[PDB]
């Protein structure tokens, strides 16, 4: 996160550390039993780690769940990064309580304007790089469609939306990945892509969450 505040510990409950030897990607946790992340954060011998501030540091709060399945979204397009969502079922079911705590889920979408919360572990400067150890957040709004598909011309799809700021400072970036994008209490963005960080008029592109909840619906009850 380039541009924000460190959240403070264990403010946002639902924010999981994907790690694998060391944090690579954010995620959400939707229920006791399932983190949702992107796609392209897919990979072997994951180790689900919630109730975390300093990744670095055990401080009391965490829990450490390695994952028993993961589910990359059918129609997931790595080229394009399209359906850039994945479910990731944990071997034992999270104790849930107030600092590891779930996101509701959309029942409708969220319209431009709207204020948002994102968050994440992920680089703090947007020219060179600097990894935070404590979890950092970002208010920002959700872009008009048209200023997003007129700052990434044809790579916008109906399953994308941007937020951000059109004149820098303030972003996601690499290492936020796959974490949440909240708005009025709803998980509705996952972090996915874009043009560097918090640079003029490549604001942030996320994973359209609304559009997938029927699919995270039924695949958690079947699985
Ligand atoms: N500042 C927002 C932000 C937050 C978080 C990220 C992390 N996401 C990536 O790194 C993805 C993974 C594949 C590659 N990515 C990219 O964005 C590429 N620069 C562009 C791309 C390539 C193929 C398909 C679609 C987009 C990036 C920007
Ligand atoms: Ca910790």
């Not at 290492?175 to 796959?178: A, H, I, L, R, V």
């Given at each position: 996160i380039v541009g924000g505040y460190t959240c403070g510990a264990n403010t946002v409950p639902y924010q999981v550390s994907l790690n694998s030897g060391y944090h690579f990607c954010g995620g959400s946790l939707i229920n006791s039993q399932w983190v949702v992340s992107a796609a392209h954060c897919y990979k072997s011998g994951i180790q689900v780690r919630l109730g975390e501030d300093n990744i670095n540091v055990v401080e009391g709060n965490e829990q450490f769940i390695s994952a028993s399945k993961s589910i990359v979204h059918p129609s997931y397009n790595s080229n394009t990064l399209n359906n850039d969502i994945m479910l990731i079922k944990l071997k034992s079911a999270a104790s849930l309580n107030s600092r590891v705590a779930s996101i509701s889920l959309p029942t409708s979408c969220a319209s431009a304007g709207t204020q948002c919360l994102i968050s994440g572990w992920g680089n703090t400067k947007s020219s060179g790089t600097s990894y935070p150890d404590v979890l950092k957040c970002l208010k920002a709004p959700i872009l008009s469609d048209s200023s997003c598909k007129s700052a990434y011309p044809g790579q916008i799809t109906s399953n994308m939306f941007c937020a951000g700021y059109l004149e820098g400072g303030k972003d996601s970036c690499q290492?936020?990945?796959?974490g949440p994008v909240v708005c009025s209490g709803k998980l509705q963005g996952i972090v996915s892509w874009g043009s560097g960080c918090a640079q003029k008029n490549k604001p942030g592109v996320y994973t359209k969450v609304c559009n997938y909840v029927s699919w995270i619906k039924q695949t958690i009850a079947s699985n």
């Open positions: 290492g936020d990945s796959g």
